[PDB]
């Protein structure tokens, strides 16, 4: 069935899974043409898959030439992200495709269920959750490399970077889920967070700052009073 | 014109046949049915008074053999029969009219609504869709389920209609899945029709027997079939022209002859509005959406 808070755990056992996250596979910036009238441009996108045990991305890189001369864009994108996650699928060896794949938006079910008949064993399911996975596109390496590709791409990562070594899955989850909850409520804010001391770099294989495990602590509770900060200064509390 | 004559009425029954129906009690004196329009299929259905639980009947063809009707005290129905003695039969059934214990079929001349909701349907197809090959004449009851029903469980008593899936790869051909998806005219025309059914008046007598079977017995089973044989023909971007025409007079003359106080249970909402007002057919069914809407405007 759907996933929510109550079966927030079957997320780190041993069945392989992967959330779809679609929200940033169609990107247009709107604009107004000579006539005064407004057309978009598309920028390039990308299907942000992801493996939330392991930490494995699939971040399958969507570019805008998908859409040149085809009508109703958004609909055809969460067809083509269902045709893309599906190759994926395919392209994996048995022994790694999933049991499940959890979208994070009900309108991909359908689209998804169609392209994976061949698949009747993967559970197709959706969420109760409002995961804050639209904030991909917030961390600066998935930007970069989305913008700068000039045709169709596939680029691994993991969004967990080293954490596994010394927490466990459950806990990276949580960590990432608050970072990219914080970079969505208030982008520059986050960002000031974890840039502020010039000290603690980035690594060239990772995506995010080396925290010592102290500094993760005092990070992530300033992640926390801006997620609610900001949640005053929008209901004014 | 023929007739279905009965040995006895044992016990009180509603005794319909197609959609006349009338009142029998307890050993009233009730010898049969008479003067039955030849030349279409026909259904003879009861509903116990004791145990309205249960609609059962039978689809009979007059032109295929003599049948009649006599109450089982062991089963606990009225079961159809067949006679093959030909002059015994003319005898019973002269003499049962000449002691004018027989119901009339009370058909109106101006009235045409049988022959325009069986215009499709054939004894030939109702045995197939029924499996029963020793008798000529088709059991269903409100309980039987389908084919389909059965894989989502006694084959012997299940409803073979044709199966239907809109996410199957019957369905959906590899590397078409949104356009099948979103246009089923593969579906419809390659599969279906040219490939199952062989030409539209199949398809149409399947679809007109689903709607009897749910009309008349309360079939669960058969009203999803009915409607999703409705949903493959307005989901599909090409219909033949004349398809679509015959479409909406069958439709309206099922409507039409559909219970007000039934509307609530045999018919699904999100068929008929997307059938009606979103898909691509809904403008091609004046008539059905006409009577619809002055009839049922509360499911729209
Ligand atoms: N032929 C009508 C009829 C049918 C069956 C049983 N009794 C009947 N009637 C009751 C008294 C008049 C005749």
């Known amino acids: 069935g759907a996933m929510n808070s109550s079966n927030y755990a079957e997320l780190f056992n041993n069945d392989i899974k992967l959330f779809v996250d679609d929200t940033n596979v169609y990107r247009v910036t709107v604009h107004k043409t000579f006539e005064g009238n407004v057309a978009t441009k598309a920028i390039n996108g990308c299907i942000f898959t992801l493996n939330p045990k392991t930490g494995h991305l699939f971040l399958k890189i969507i570019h805008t030439s998908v859409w040149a001369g085809q009508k109703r864009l958004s609909q055809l994108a969460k067809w083509k992200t269902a045709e893309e996650v599906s190759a994926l699928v395919r392209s994996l060896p048995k022994e790694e495709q999933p049991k499940q794949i959890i979208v994070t938006r009900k309108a991909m079910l359908d689209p998804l269920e169609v392209h994976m008949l061949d698949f009747p064993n993967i559970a197709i399911r959706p969420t109760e959750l409002r995961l804050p996975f639209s904030a991909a596109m917030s961390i600066d390496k998935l930007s970069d490399v989305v913008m700068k590709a000039t045709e169709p791409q596939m680029v691994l990562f993991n969004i967990y970077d080293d954490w596994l070594d010394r927490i466990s899955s459950y806990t990276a989850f949580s960590r990432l889920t608050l970072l990219l909850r914080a970079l969505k409520t208030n982008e520059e804010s986050a960002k000031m967070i974890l840039l502020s001391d010039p000290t603690i770099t980035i690594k060239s294989y990772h995506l995010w700052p080396s925290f010592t495990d102290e500094q993760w602590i005092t990070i992530e509770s300033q992640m926390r009073d801006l997620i609610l900060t900001e949640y005053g200064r929008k209901y004014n509390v | ?300």
């Open chain 2, 1 to 300: 014109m023929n007739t279905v004559p009965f040995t006895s009425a044992p016990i009180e029954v509603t005794i319909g046949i197609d959609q006349y129906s009338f009142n029998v009690k307890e050993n009233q004196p009730f010898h049969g049915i008479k003067d039955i329009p030849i030349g279409h299929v026909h259904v003879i259905h009861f509903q116990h008074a004791d145990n309205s639980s249960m609609r059962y009947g039978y689809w009979f063809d007059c032109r295929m053999g003599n049948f009649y009707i006599q109450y089982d005290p062991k089963d606990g129905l009225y079961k159809m029969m067949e006679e093959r003695d030909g002059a015994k039969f003319e005898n019973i059934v002269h003499n049962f009219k000449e002691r004018q214990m027989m119901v009339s079929y009370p058909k109106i001349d101006e009235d045409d609504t049988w022959y325009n909701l069986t215009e499709f349907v054939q004894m030939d197809k109702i045995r197939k869709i029924v499996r029963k090959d020793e008798n000529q004449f088709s059991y269903v009851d409100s309980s039987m389920t389908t084919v389909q029903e059965n894989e989502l469980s006694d084959p012997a008593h299940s409803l073979n209609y044709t199966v239907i899936n809109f996410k199957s790869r019957e369905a959906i051909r590899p590397g078409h899945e949104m356009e099948d998806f979103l246009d089923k005219s593969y579906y419809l025309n390659t599969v279906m029709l040219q490939g199952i059914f062989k030409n539209s008046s199949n398809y149409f007598g399947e679809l007109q027997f689903a709607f009897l079977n749910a009309m008349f017995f309360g079939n669960y089973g058969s009203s999803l079939q009915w409607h999703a044989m409705i949903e493959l023909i307005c989901s599909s971007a090409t219909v033949p022209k004349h398809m679509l025409d015959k479409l909406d007079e069958i439709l309206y003359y099922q409507i039409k002859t559909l219970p007000e106080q039934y509307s609530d249970i045999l018919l699904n909402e999100r068929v008929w509005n997307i059938c009606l007002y979103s898909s691509f057919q809904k403008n091609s069914l004046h008539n059905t959406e006409k009577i619809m809407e002055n009839k049922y405007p509360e499911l729209l």
